[PDB]
Design a protein around this ligand. Structure first.
Ligand SMILES: Nc1ncnc2c1ncn2[C@@H]1O[C@H](COP(=O)(O)OP(=O)(O)OP(=O)(O)O)[C@@H](O)[C@H]1O
Ligand SMILES: [K+]
Ligand SMILES: [Mg+2]
Lengths: 259, 159, 584, 88
């Protein structure tokens, strides 16, 4: 669990490190510019040594080649001494250059990370969704089709939706069954309850009155706000729970008054 | 606009300016561009220092106006400019302003042949402040104080 | 992969969760590697030892495995809810054993003789009586979907009623982590289904960006622009869930002002990293500056997406109408990105139709004599379009930018210029259109001709005007009120006075002084000069000048100090025209 | 006027909270009895039409409403001023 590699990070535009008497937008400019200058200044100081060391490496190598040529040859009685003094002085120089280079790399290993030195890009792909375009259909068939596609599949689920008449289980169906939030689901409760009126089934008419006024609330709300009914929320049910709550005391008569 | 402040209030502004300057130096930021038109007042006289703002010469140190070396910026350079700002706060009037010739300023400041006129300072200026102004604009960088010293002096001076 | 007979003790790789309300237990089962007797003693018996890392060390030359459990302290979190823990396990190379402890300083190991497990491990928690919450169907679903929905094996939940006597719901882990795939393999249907699953939106994303980054800091990410602004996007009472940060596909953190700026908070998405310095708790990240470096790479990419989206005129219109409020807030706050954010702006203009133009489109239509960009601010396009301030500007055929929502008064403070050209308000003192010497001569004849009328109108109105002067901007109106060059414009004052929680003690400082401009070419004004010349102290001139001033003030956008004085003047003039013979 | 002035305006939501304006007559007021008489005496009378609209624009200001376009209102004023002075 060694996390030390992460310890030294510099973020130019860091908002948590500020002072009340310095203008924030100018403080980011000075810290930004400063890290840039350091990276250029340090790179100049490094490249100066690369220039320097290459020269001494070549000078020592060539004088050593010449040393090999002269030490076996006439005048070698002095030119061995000269070209050895060159090989050795230039070799001393090489060592000095290496020390400067190794101090520079140990200084680089001591510098903090920043947004340029931590990473590089990999994948990059952008897509824009052109596909959805406007379409029309004959609603007489859509109605019958939505009855087959949903109502015949969800009429048994009427007992899964709200049965207590002042706060309800399954209220999260604004997520779980969002595609059914429509006028056809309200028409469903008027088409399908006809057997309940004929058979005087008051308790089912009373519990489904709660589901009915909720459908009328969300669809009327969506009409009234010019919004998609699917964009309603259980916060909106909580908002009609505030102050004076409900008008369903009249809908307890609708079940007879609508016959 | 030449509006006026009470001596206490002038000190409060100088104090906040120093308090900001010290924070910059602590972060190893040399402000360099220090001008009284680069310091701004806000509600409650909150001081905001920034790069947001003749003056091409006036606030710079004798070595910097000379371009005596390659951008010889240091904390003391900022101190010099600070001292100049203190001088104008403590006079209501720009330094050297019995003269205005451009080359004469480069000559007389650069070669050490005039201080700002500390005889122009407010009669209500604490002697300690008169010294602080004089100290902050001492000619040699090695002779002038750093912000920690300046600020310490200001708080002691104000109390 | 290298010994294929290893799976002959059971072929399938899966996870099962099995609550038991009747017996007050929660069981977790897997078909993974399992443990030998030596591994039960060493790995469950030793605090801060991890079998997982030892395993990872034995792998060579970059194996395609990236495991989660580095620290060797998490197993004991079982005792947060349990009174007693039993682990039953079987490796391929060993018998079946039980491990048991109640964390009382010791543990037991026993050879098991119950129903066999083919391979792997069964963890059994005997829950505390005040922790029975985790036996309930609803909390198990919430917890698994909150923390573990991207783990990459099927997680199945078993319950004794649904009709079925054991529902076995795999749907706890139904969605795949799409960002792990190569994006060239991924179609818009796949991004679409994921994004619905990430956000619970019923409609597709407008645009999506998939990207990755490499080096010391490694991550992959998905960013989505929604087709609609969320109904409550800007509410300051709601904690945002918008970006989630995962490490090795497990959920770390949320609620993040650190990962993305507040002006970009409508973007939904996922960031998933292979390696970060996590806290012991796994709830947070140790070096918090990392989040800031992740942010600086997100913002660049977000801006690029917007820019590319600006090439599709159709889709950029949908985007901009949902989120234009966002970009202008970015101009105000982001001192670094202001310059790109400005190229994303569009406005209605006077030379344009009902279609919007960019500032670079204003600049390309500029005349060679224009040195600035002209604009007007106000409460609606109709109110600024017929405005008195734009009469000579439009007469001379300059283009004028129309800015007509309250947030425009904020971003224009900070956007001083575009493409080196400055913005100039037609509402301020000291406007100029390009000069023509003939006109200059006429203005010098005019300021001489009207000089003492301006003096009288600065004697009458003295309390409440800085100067009276000839207009260089009026046509077809007798006057306008304009503000000083520093301090608030007429519109800025209206906005400020309505800020419910703002301290108004500073209004005396930030309100600008009023300037009055007269049109000298106009009938009422020239007849007012003649009458004022006829007698300077005629109270009728003092009356007429005040009635003109209030009318101008109102049409210029300033509230009247008391509207009843004003209405009463009107009701008196109405009587005079309406033929009331009773003057009383 | 507070709601129209907020920076983070959410203007999609805005249209639905505009209240309906109702106009109340003072039946004792001498302008409106003169109007009651001109309304009986000639119904096609454009003078009434102009009076009723100028009263309405003036009534908006009294009650704290802004004008939909302040220029049309000021023009009605600059016409009365020109007639009063005898300019045209
Ligand atoms: N079902 C299992 N099958 C095999 N090994 C397991 C199983 N469950 C736990 N382990 C062993 O228990 C060890 C300790 O796990 P524990 O969760 O306590 O710590 P860890 O996984 O090593 O670290 P971390 O706290 O990050 O998860 C594991 O490293 C592994 O060897
Ligand atoms: K362990
Ligand atoms: Mg573990």
């Amino acid at each position: 669990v060694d996390y030390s590699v992460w310890d030294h990070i510099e973020v130019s535009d860091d908002e948590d490190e500020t002072h009340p008497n310095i203008d924030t937008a100018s403080l980011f400019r000075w810290r930004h510019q400063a890290r840039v200058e350091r990276m250029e200044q340090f790179q100049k100081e490094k490249e100066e040594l690369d220039r320097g060391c290459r020269e001494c490496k070549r000078k020592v190598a060539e004088c050593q080649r010449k040393l090999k040529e002269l030490e076996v040859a006439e005048g070698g009685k002095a030119e061995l001494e000269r070209l050895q003094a060159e090989a050795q002085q230039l070799r001393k120089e090489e060592r000095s250059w290496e020390q400067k280079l190794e101090e520079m790399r140990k200084k680089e290993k001591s510098m903090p990370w920043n947004v340029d030195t931590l990473s590089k890009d990999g994948f990059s792909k952008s897509m824009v969704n052109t596909k959805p375009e406007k379409t029309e259909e004959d609603s007489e068939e859509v109605r019958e089709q939505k009855h087959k596609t949903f109502v015949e599949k969800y009429e048994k689920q009427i007992k899964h939706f709200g049965m207590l008449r002042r706060w309800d289980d399954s209220q999260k169906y604004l997520s779980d069954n969002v595609h059914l939030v429509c006028e056809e689901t309200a028409n469903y409760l008027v088409i399908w309850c006809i057997d309940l009126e004929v058979e005087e089934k008051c308790a089912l008419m009373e519990q489904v009155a709660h589901q009915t006024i909720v459908m009328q609330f969300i669809l009327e709300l969506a009409k009234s706000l010019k919004v998609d009914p699917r964009a309603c929320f259980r916060q909106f049910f909580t908002k009609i729970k505030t102050a004076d709550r409900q008008y369903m005391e009249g809908f307890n008569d609708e079940l007879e008054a609508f016959k | 606009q030449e509006t006026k402040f009470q001596m206490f209030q002038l000190i409060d502004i100088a104090r906040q300016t120093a308090q900001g300057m010290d924070y910059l130096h602590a972060k190893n930021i040399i402000h360099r561009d220090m001008k009284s038109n680069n310091i701004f007042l806000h509600e409650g006289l909150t001081v905001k220092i920034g790069d947001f703002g003749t003056g091409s010469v006036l606030w710079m140190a004798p070595e910097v106006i000379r371009m005596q070396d390659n951008n010889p910026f240091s904390f003391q350079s900022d101190v010099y400019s600070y001292g100049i700002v203190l001088y104008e706060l403590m006079t209501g009037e720009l330094p050297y302003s019995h003269i205005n010739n451009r080359d004469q300023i480069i000559f007389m400041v650069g070669r050490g042949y005039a201080s700002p006129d500390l005889s122009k300072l407010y009669k209500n200026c604490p002697k300690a402040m008169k010294r602080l102004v004089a100290d902050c604009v001492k000619k040699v960088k090695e002779e002038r104080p750093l912000f920690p010293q300046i600020l310490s002096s200001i708080e002691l001076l104000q109390h | 992969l290298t010994d294929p007979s290893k799976l002959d003790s059971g072929k399938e790789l899966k996870i099962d969760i099995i609550p038991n309300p009747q017996e007050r237990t929660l069981t977790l089962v897997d078909t993974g590697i399992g443990m030998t007797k030596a591994d039960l003693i060493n790995n469950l018996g030793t605090i801060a030892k991890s079998g997982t890392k030892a395993f990872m060390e034995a792998l060579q030359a970059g194996a395609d495995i990236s495991m989660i459990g580095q620290f060797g302290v998490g197993f004991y979190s079982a005792y947060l809810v349990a009174e007693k823990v039993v682990v039953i396990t079987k490796h391929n190379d060993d018998e079946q054993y039980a491990w048991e402890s109640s964390a009382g300083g010791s543990f037991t190991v026993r050879a098991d003789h119950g129903e066999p497990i083919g391979r792997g491990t069964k963890v059994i928690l005997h829950l505390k009586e005040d922790q029975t919450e985790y036996l309930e169907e609803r909390r198990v679903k919430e917890v698994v979907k909150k923390h573990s929905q991207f783990i990459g094996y099927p997680i199945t939940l078993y319950l004794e009623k649904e009709k079925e006597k054991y529902i076995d719901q795999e749907e706890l882990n139904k969605t795949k982590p799409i960002w792990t795939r190569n994006p060239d393999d991924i179609t818009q249907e796949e991004y679409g289904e994921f994004y619905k699953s990430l956000t619970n939106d019923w409609e597709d994303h407008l645009a999506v960006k998939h990207f990755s980054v490499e080096g010391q800091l490694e991550f992959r990410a998905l960013l989505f622009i929604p087709r609609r602004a969320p109904f409550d996007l800007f509410e300051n009472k709601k904690k945002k869930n918008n970006i989630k940060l995962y490490v090795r596909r497990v959920f770390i953190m949320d609620s993040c002002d650190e990962l993305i700026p507040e002006y970009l908070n409508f973007i939904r998405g996922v960031v998933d990293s292979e390696d970060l310095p996590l806290n012991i708790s796994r709830e947070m990240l140790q070096q918090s500056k990392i989040l800031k470096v992740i942010r600086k790479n997100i913002v660049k990419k977000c801006l690029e997406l917007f820019s590319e989206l600006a090439e599709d005129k159709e889709n950029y219109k949908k985007f901009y109408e949902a989120f234009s409020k966002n970009l202008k807030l970015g101009i105000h706050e982001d001192s670094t990105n202001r310059r790109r954010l400005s190229e994303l702006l569009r406005y209605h203009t006077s030379q344009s139709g009902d279609e919007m133009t960019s500032l670079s489109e204003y600049v390309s239509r500029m005349k060679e004599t224009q040195k600035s960009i002209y604009y007007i601010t106000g409460e609606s396009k109709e109110q600024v379009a017929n405005s008195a301030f734009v009469e000579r500007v439009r007469k001379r055929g300059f283009e004028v930018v129309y800015m007509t929502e309250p947030i425009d008064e904020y971003c224009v403070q900070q956007l001083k210029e575009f493409d080196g050209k400055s913005l100039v308000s037609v509402t301020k003192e000291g406007l100029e259109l390009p000069e023509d010497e003939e006109e200059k001569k006429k203005m010098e004849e005019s300021k001489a001709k009207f000089e003492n009328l301006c003096k009288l109108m600065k004697e009458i109105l003295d309390k409440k005007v800085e100067k009276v002067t000839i207009s260089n901007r009026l046509v077809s109106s007798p006057c306008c009120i304009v503000t000083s060059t520093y301090g608030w414009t007429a519109n800025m004052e209206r906005i400020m006075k309505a800020q419910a929680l703002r301290d108004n003690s500073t209004m005396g400082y930030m309100m600008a002084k009023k300037h009055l401009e007269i049109n000298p070419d106009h009938p009422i004004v020239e007849t007012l000069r003649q009458k004022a010349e006829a007698d300077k102290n005629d109270k009728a001139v003092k009356d007429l000048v005040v009635l003109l001033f209030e009318t101008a003030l109102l049409s210029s956008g300033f509230s009247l100090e008391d509207p009843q004085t004003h209405s009463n003047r009107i009701y008196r003039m109405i009587k005079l025209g309406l033929g009331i013979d009773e003057d009383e």
